[PDB]
Write an enzyme that holds these catalytic residues in place. Sequence first.
Site, short mmCIF file in Angstrom:
data_model
loop_
_atom_site.label_atom_id
_atom_site.label_comp_id
_atom_site.label_asym_id
_atom_site.label_seq_id
_atom_site.Cartn_x
_atom_site.Cartn_y
_atom_site.Cartn_z
N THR A 1 15.52 -15.72 16.43
CA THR A 1 15.89 -16.23 17.28
C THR A 1 14.73 -17.58 17.59
O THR A 1 14.05 -17.09 17.30
CB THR A 1 15.92 -15.61 18.25
OG1 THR A 1 17.48 -15.17 18.31
CG2 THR A 1 15.84 -16.28 20.13
N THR A 2 15.47 -19.13 17.49
CA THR A 2 15.12 -20.26 18.16
C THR A 2 15.42 -20.60 19.14
O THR A 2 16.33 -20.85 19.17
CB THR A 2 14.48 -21.29 16.75
OG1 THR A 2 14.34 -20.13 15.69
CG2 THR A 2 13.58 -22.10 17.19
N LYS A 33 23.39 -18.68 23.47
CA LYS A 33 22.09 -17.84 23.76
C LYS A 33 21.72 -18.71 24.67
O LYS A 33 20.30 -18.29 25.73
CB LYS A 33 20.74 -17.72 22.35
CG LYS A 33 21.23 -17.18 20.97
CD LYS A 33 20.11 -17.71 19.96
CE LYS A 33 20.63 -16.52 18.51
NZ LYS A 33 19.37 -16.01 18.27
N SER A 129 11.78 -15.46 17.02
CA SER A 129 11.29 -15.79 15.96
C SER A 129 10.94 -16.84 14.93
O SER A 129 9.36 -17.09 14.40
CB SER A 129 12.39 -14.46 15.20
OG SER A 129 13.21 -15.02 15.07
#
Lengths: 196, 241, 125, 250, 195, 204, 243, 226, 244
Positions: A1-2, A33, A129
């Site tokens: 996930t960014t 998100k 991540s």
Amino acid sequence: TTIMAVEFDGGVVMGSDSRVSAGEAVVNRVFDKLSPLHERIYCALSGSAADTQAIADIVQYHLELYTSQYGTPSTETAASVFKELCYENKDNLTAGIIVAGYDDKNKGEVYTIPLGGSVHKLPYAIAGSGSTFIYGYCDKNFRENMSKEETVDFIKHSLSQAIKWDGSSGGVIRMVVLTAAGVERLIFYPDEYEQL
Amino acid sequence: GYDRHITIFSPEGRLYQVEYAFKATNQTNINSLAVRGKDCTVVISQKKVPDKLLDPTTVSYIFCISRTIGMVVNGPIPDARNAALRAKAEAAEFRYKYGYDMPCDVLAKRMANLSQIYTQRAYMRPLGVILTFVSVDEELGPSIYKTDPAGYYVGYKATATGPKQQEITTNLENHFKKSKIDHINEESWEKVVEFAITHMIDALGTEFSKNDLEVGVATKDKFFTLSAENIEERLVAIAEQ
Amino acid sequence: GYDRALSIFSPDGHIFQVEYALEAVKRGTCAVGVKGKNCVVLGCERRSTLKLQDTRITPSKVSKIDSHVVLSFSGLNADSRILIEKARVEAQSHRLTLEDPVTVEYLTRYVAGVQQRYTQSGGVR
Amino acid sequence: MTDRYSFSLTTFSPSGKLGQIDYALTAVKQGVTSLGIKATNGVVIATEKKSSSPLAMSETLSKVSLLTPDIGAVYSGMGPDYRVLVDKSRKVAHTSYKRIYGEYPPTKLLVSEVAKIMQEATQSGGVRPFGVSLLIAGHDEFNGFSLYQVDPSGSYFPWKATAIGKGSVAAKTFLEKRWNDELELEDAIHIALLTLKESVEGEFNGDTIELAIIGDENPDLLGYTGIPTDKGPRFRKLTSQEINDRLEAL
Amino acid sequence: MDIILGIRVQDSVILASSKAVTRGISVLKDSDDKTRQLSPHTLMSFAGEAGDTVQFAEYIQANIQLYSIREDYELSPQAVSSFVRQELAKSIRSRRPYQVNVLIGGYDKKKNKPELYQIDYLGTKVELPYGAHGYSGFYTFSLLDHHYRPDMTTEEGLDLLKLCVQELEKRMPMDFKGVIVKIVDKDGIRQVDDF
Amino acid sequence: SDPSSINGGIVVAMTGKDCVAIACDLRLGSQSLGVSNKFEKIFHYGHVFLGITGLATDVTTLNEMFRYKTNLYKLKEERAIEPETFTQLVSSSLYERRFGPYFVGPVVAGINSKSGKPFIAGFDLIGCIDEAKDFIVSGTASDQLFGMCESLYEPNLEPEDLFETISQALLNAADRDALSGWGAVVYIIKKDEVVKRYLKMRQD
Amino acid sequence: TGYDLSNSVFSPDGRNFQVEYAVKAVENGTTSIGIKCNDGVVFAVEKLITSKLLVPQKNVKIQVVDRHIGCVYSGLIPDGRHLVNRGREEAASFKKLYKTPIPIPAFADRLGQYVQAHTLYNSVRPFGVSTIFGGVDKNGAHLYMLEPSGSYWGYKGAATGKGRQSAKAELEKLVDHHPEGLSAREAVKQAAKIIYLAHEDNKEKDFELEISWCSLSETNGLHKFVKGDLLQEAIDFAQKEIN
Amino acid sequence: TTIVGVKFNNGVVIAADTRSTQGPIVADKNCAKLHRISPKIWCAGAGTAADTEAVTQLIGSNIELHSLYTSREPRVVSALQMLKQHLFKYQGHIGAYLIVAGVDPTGSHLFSIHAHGSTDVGYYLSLGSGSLAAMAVLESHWKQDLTKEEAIKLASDAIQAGIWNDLGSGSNVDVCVMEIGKDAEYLRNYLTPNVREEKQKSYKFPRGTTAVLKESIVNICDIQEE
Amino acid sequence: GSRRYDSRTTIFSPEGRLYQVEYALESISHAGTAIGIMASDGIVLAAERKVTSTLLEQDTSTEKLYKLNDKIAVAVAGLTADAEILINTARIHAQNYLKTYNEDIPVEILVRRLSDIKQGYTQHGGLRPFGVSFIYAGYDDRYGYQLYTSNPSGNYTGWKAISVGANTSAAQTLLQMDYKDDMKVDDAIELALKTLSKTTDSSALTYDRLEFATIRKGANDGEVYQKIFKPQEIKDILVKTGIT
Ligand SMILES: [Cl-]
Ligand SMILES: [Cl-]
Ligand SMILES: [Cl-]
Ligand SMILES: [Mg+2]
Ligand SMILES: [Mg+2]
Ligand SMILES: [Mg+2]
């Protein structure tokens, strides 16, 4: 996930990718998100999908009940409620949360709550991540008192790189712009951000 | 004669503690009125600041329960705020558990069920308040639902509460007998407030200044209360025709 | 739980609920005990106001607590069953832990203890 | 705080009367008249919608309530006491039956459960009895159609037809003359409307009368198709129009 | 564990139970009676985890003696076995289960029949003409299968039991220091003092 | 170690024309040791039949529990429980022990007294219902029973033909399982008569 | 009758007599006042010197809640302390969860709901105190007064105790003569005068004046006690006005 | 197990295969995985079969009570919220993986939920061992503004992919169509492309083939009168 | 506080009587008469429904005679709602005993437990006692056919013939006059109905005002059968005995 939040002149901008992965399999490639807790307070969620969604729901309930009694909560207040849940239940949770909000007195504010359940107020925050690949880029390129357009470009370029290198990240770049004017939702597709 | 002290049946099959709680309702000597428009629900209540030492901004019997639901109370302020806090907690909990905003009539029922328990359980006294819940419900539209110390509730086309409720009720009855519709056929909420104030003046036979009234307005996706200046603009429009 | 103090002192230093419990005993059918040199006999009155009674199955007035101890009573029949049950359990509990059947004095002391407890416990007569 | 009322508020008087139950029955007597009539192919329950104010929307107040798809309930006495009993009756149908046997309870056993809740409020600490009498009409596969009355004491009796509340005595005499074991559902509705007119003073129409039936399965009201065995609810509330149609043939 | 045998003949039940109590390295005792009288015409032999065996046996005994006094009546062997099974079935899903296996030898005075019940620590009840627990069955059941007849006398039952113990003393690695034998019949419970 | 295969044993249930059949072996063992050749695994509460395989202590406990519950059902309902209802009770009863379950493989068989419709059902140890038209299998030789039943079974068999099919399905399945056999029972169930037959089979 | 023997019992009027009796205990107590100034609040109380043996300035009556709220009360002093103890728990939990110090209107309701809770049951007694409290939050100055019934409102000025009628009259003059508002330093002087004027109802025994204040400019929005020179200046101003 | 949900113009369609397996053994060849939470809210379950069935009946029960209490037709977001708060509390120990679909006064909705209490939102979802086979078909053929007849075909095509390519899936296809302003239509065995061929031989035995020791009449009747 | 409103249900009178027990017995004296008669070859339970209506559904109605298990039944006199609470408890106890010992509960053990529950409400809890008196008709293989009664005090006694409810004084005198030890079920049926017929407050005894039950070894061989009489079966026995 960014995911990432950036403080600017007008207010604050939150950005994220849209990929949810189970091992090597992309379960959902267009997940949102960026979740609102109040009208001009949003949160970006990283770690356990179950743990993060459960906590977000409780904070949303707390800010709603807060608003009914005491009026609009501060971004600081919203961050504090998250920390309380994350810190007290640190043994049973895997949640990394960025909180970005807009007051009229405090204007744009960004808070990060890592795994431990600690709180850090920052001009900008990166998490998930993909964030590990853009620590160099974000530190070199971030300025204080950027314009809306500059901040959108900074987040677009940042998450672009983090998507390029991180297998756990990908899909569309969703962004939420919190200002006095209100809430604006932005989406950027692969064909746009890949050629940057 | 301890059947008059706690909520047990008298030989007539009456609950005297419930009946005396209804009498406490009028202790404030305030009259409230609720009417429905096409797109809105309006509630007006008399505002009396008898002491010059009071901060008049803090004197209110209208409460913002949720974003959508408003509540006016007829009764003492302690019991009013007790009911207000509980209604706010119940509305917030409902949204968390069931994932949609608590309807006006469902909150009314929940508070009525809580009131019923106080009429059956001896250790808990009834609250000496009549709660009038207003909203623009996303399914039912403009909604007025009123609760009392007996645990009774029902939906209303319009309603009045307080010492002079009968005078206001009959006034409203007579208007709806003419129009033969369940609402005020008016586009803007401003004109529905102007109607509500006009018909209270006619019913009570008293003139109002901006500080003598307290107004709550329910529209789609928000309930809000009017400022003294918003009420003044309303009073000016009434006088000019 | 119901905690009301039913057994309380009066100005003259009497506990009326304990004294009114003795009035229930006075009403109960007569029971007598006589110990010889090498035996004890328990005699019990049966009021003949009840005929058409089935004497096979009707609760007998003398109850075995153990193989060596018996209990008779005067007063409320329903109340006596609770004392007999508690006594019978304590008799088997004593055998289990002390590896010896109760003495008559010990069994009496236990039953007398239960009766006392119900004269200064809340919510019990 | 704490509920320190852990003792019975209902106790036997020297004459052997349970005062609070008698007084609860007095509250039921003051209540608006409601009745129930059992036919060969259905049951009908009816009551007056005694509107407290004309400004009040009497449609939003439901005196006749669905408990299960095949069981309905009406009352005489205290409305609030009825409303909470309906909430408890609906839940106990699920918790103490449907979640165990995977099917809705038969009429007599749900009545048994409602009766138990009303009995406990007659003996439990720091509560008064329920100030309502219930008329519960239902259908189940093995017992067929049934009608039950439940009193504040918790006592319940099965009826061919009965009435409770204000004008019950007169209404029961009227039902005794008209009832037979060969009545069709439409005949029972006709007798129900005749009987109810006697105890009503003011307006008598579909807007002032609340009437529901336990009759044939309603597949139109099921909400889904595909499962043959699922044929829909037997409980149906008659509309304002449906009542007025039968008041012309009155 | 320790050897506990049972055989139901014509008019009685015979329970044989080893006398050895071993704590790891040393044999602490060679005269241990691994049985409790539950009622005048019911006997229970037991084998399992140290401490738990006696604690369970005495607990059952106390409960059956309590019932006997309360009702002035001896429970049938079947009724006693059902009670014991439920207590072991309850025990397995407890915080710390009793590791105890039992044989219940009783003479039913109503039916005038001997009865033998075999219950393991799980609460697995079976009515048998002859039973055992642990490894005892592995050595003895082939002999019992061959020789057992339902119309056997007590003396014939004891002779078949001697042949079973002899096979155990030959092929079992552990010295169990012989067996105490007890007979359950219409006249009650008695111990065979020479075996 | 595996609780479901300490004691061993099998149950099979089949549907025929206006009839159902349920059958079980008679073995109870302690792993390799054969303990009892009279341990029946089929019980009945009125006209509803329940076969239970798995841990023997749980087989006995659940029989006692369902006797308890169906006896209270009858007193309150004033009628014998039906197979469809009893299935839902077994499912409910097993799942309330979700995180401490009975190690059993129950099998319900019976004819609805009102509709006259033949009914069979199977459950996993936590109460998931398998409502098969044809046949239900359970126990340490369930693979063998599936193999036998899948080939031998045909629909609408007459009671006396269904007996031969279920009997041959059980026997040959048991003879390929170490922990099954030592005798067998077959129930042939019609609307208002039930015949019980003990089969002669190899005792190894 | 018998409606006044038990708390939470409605009389045929619709009154809770036990609460009305609690007000009598409040009316019996010493005079306490509150004044809302331009950027804060001032609290003052009358302390009756029962004996010479009382150590001056030691038996402090005014209490702080958190660091920004002042509380003063008239009636049963222990009941006042019990209420302030609860107030401190409420303010502590609010700040623990929401980070920001509790707003004054939010704190007012926390006391209000708690006092109201002691009118719901016959197993508890109503509070025998009227509490004047307030301070500075993000939305500026707030002054509240809370009666035994659980009733509270916002005030420009507040008074309670035996000399409340005298005090109220003096407060009403200040509201009329200063519509633009009163300064913190002026409010301290006026507070001293009003307590000295209200002491005519308790004229038998001499008293000790105690003042506190929260002001955005004077105390940085924190609650502080008026001490030394500023207290003496206020006493001098008060003594000059009575003569 | 293969389960899919597909959004279309005026509603949502849910489909699933009909096979239940005990590891490699097939327990039921015609299982029903399409469960009803409420009349117009259907869901399909993968994972622990007991858990999916149990968790839908509990929420389905509480939804019915909520519907009666509020005098409102039940909402999908209510079922959703109640399922995730239940499953989260049990920290994945209830192995229920569900695709929830339905229509309510708000409109048509399609959600997924995993055992740990996470939820997913989309126009097309898949679940179970055959989810990858199904998702391949959905990703190839899904377009915006699908008609009801296109959505049924796409959903059915996605299950077939699972049936043929995933060993954990097989037999027929079950479908349920939930269109706005209509009754939900449950299409049990919509497709049946796996009918067993006729056997080469009949295995009906001659009567008296089995050896019998004892016969006896079983008394299923109560204790008789007289 | 709360003490003010406490009736104190579990206290002795100065004479040493339990007020609430005595008042509960007064309540029961107004309930419909129930009669139990024990014979050598079975037991009879006969009970009178209280002033009924023509519109009462009798065939599905039960207010007097309840089944506890296959061997034990009870006749109720008092509050029907109170009785059902105790009946459901007794039914569970009978099943608990059957699960534990794998034998049907002996009649006296069931009667003692229900009687012990009633007793508890007179000694502790501060609740009102159960306004119910039971006649227990049961069979076991120890004592055979047994009749018991229990009242709100929790005292129980065994009987050859007994009545509870209204006019017990008149009823008990008539039973004491005509009962003999060598009596059979068919004779006991006649006695039970003849007694109700004379003691009834109603003008005439009819089928619609009666509940009837027999426990017979009139079950094929060595077993016992309970028979709750249907409305038509009560009408037949009324004609047979010559009352209608
Ligand atoms: Cl508000
Ligand atoms: Cl509620
Ligand atoms: Cl999975
Ligand atoms: Mg009360
Ligand atoms: Mg084999
Ligand atoms: Mg072998």
